[PDB]
């Protein structure tokens, strides 16, 4: 089985917190993933979110397709729209980004990707927001522990994630309907930290670090991780397990740690029945830049808002959100915000 940890409610930097942080890092370095225990409220909120997702996916496609916005990428993506390593993927997705009203300063100013979630209804909204509040508390604990485990100042990562661009993919994978069962191909996630939850069906596989195996830096053009290793062992089945979430590093943690953590490759196999899952990304602030922690003389950076916006424009090039960015030249706002700051 995967390793399982219980996180303290508060992380203070005591020697035992540092020891736990070291154990989390070791588990990522050995297995690529670990489990964290959920308490009764965390578990209840997870199950409610999955139930809301199932109910929404039963709504007619005409209704689901109306849950879209030209200000934010939040909302519905039909099956077959996302592509991994050139092949369309199978799940239907509702993406929840930061839910900002039109009166928020950033929405008023037209910042790309900022706007109100096009929620299907208030009951779904409440289920997702409550769940994401708990996921965020866990993400902050994890990032303090990770800093401590590397002997870094406790707030090294959480300074970047203040008002972070946290977002969640609420997924339904269809049952297998032919010889094809690649629900999503092998890939690595583009963000900082991933917390994943799933129902009891099963289908997620992850790749641990492999001694001697070359890994691409997926944040760079020309070093895509997509499709790599898909048909070669090892792939660990993430067995559905009551009372846990799983946690793995994304591309930005690989970048910041110089590869001491690797962004965990993962893929999904369609089951013989539908599968519900949620993938939560605990992210830097839209205005924050990731930087190499252990190479002080390296000048490379990842500006998070640019990273996110470019990714979503490339993945959803015909969505009304992308069209409006182009029509109103909203990328110019990112250039402007990068100004008068200390690089
Ligand atoms: Mn993924």
Swiss-Prot record:
Protein's GO biological process: ethylene biosynthetic process
A Pfam entry, by short name: DIOX_N
Positions that bind Fe cation: 187, 266
Enzyme kind, highest EC tier: oxidoreductase
Thermal dependence of activity, per record: Optimum temperature is 20-25 degrees Celsius.
Reaction(s) catalysed (UniProt annotation): 2-oxoglutarate + O2 + 2 H(+) = ethene + 3 CO2 + H2O; L-arginine + 2-oxoglutarate + O2 = guanidine + L-glutamate 5-semialdehyde + succinate + CO2
pH dependence: Optimum pH is 7.0-7.5.
Pathway: Alkene biosynthesis; ethylene biosynthesis via 2-oxoglutarate
UniProt superkingdom: Bacteria
Gene Ontology molecular function terms on file: 2-oxoglutarate oxygenase/decarboxylase (ethylene-forming) activity; dioxygenase activity; metal ion binding
Stored PROSITE patterns: FE2OG_OXY
Summary of the function given for this chain in its UniProt record: Simultaneously catalyzes two reactions, namely formation of ethylene and of succinate from 2-oxoglutarate, with a molar ratio of 2:1.
Subunit field text: Monomer.
Miscellaneous note of the record: A dual-circuit mechanism has been proposed in PubMed:1445291 for the complete reaction, in which the binding of L-arginine and 2-oxoglutarate in a Schiff-base structure generates a common intermediate for the two reactions.
UniProt name for this protein: 2-oxoglutarate-dependent ethylene/succinate-forming enzyme
Provenance organism: Pseudomonas savastanoi pv. phaseolicola (Pseudomonas syringae pv. phaseolicola)
């Amino acid at each position: 089985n995967l390793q399982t940890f219980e996180l303290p409610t508060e992380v203070t930097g005591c020697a035992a917190d540092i020891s736990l942080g070291r154990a989390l890092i070791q588990a990522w370095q050995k297995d690529g993933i670990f489990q964290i225990k959920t308490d009764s409220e965390q578990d209840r909120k997870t199950q409610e979110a999955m139930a809301a997702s199932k109910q929404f996916c039963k709504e007619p496609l005409t209704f689901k397709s109306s849950c879209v916005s030209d200000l934010t990428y939040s909302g519905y993506v039909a099956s077959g729209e996302e592509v991994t390593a050139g092949k369309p993927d199978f799940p239907e997705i509702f993406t929840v980004c930061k839910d900002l009203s039109v009166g928020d300063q950033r929405v008023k100013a037209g910042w790309p990707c900022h706007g109100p979630v096009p929620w299907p209804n208030n009951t779904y909204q409440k289920s997702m927001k409550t769940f994401m509040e708990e996921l965020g508390l866990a993400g902050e604990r994890l990032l303090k522990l990770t800093a401590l485990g590397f002997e870094l100042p406790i707030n090294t990562f959480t300074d970047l994630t203040r008002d972070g661009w946290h977002h969640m993919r609420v997924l339904r994978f269809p049952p297998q309907t032919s010889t094809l069962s690649r629900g999503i191909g092998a890939h690595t996630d583009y963000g900082l930290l991933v917390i994943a939850a799933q129902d009891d069906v099963g289908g997620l596989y992850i790749r641990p670090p492999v001694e001697g195996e070359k890994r691409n830096r997926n944040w760079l053009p020309g070093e895509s991780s997509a499709g790599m290793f898909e048909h070669d062992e090892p792939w660990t089945f993430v067995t559905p397990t009551p009372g846990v979430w799983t946690v793995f590093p994304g591309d930005i943690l690989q970048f910041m740690t110089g590869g001491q953590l690797l962004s965990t490759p993962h893929k999904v196999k369609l089951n013989t029945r539908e599968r519900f899952a949620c993938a939560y990304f605990h992210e830097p602030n839209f205005e924050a830049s990731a930087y190499p922690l252990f190479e002080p003389s390296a000048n490379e950076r990842i500006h998070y808002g640019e990273h996110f916006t470019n990714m979503f424009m490339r993945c959803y090039p015909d969505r009304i959100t992308t069209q409006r960015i182009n029509k109103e030249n909203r990328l110019a706002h990112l250039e402007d915000l990068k100004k008068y700051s200390d690089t």
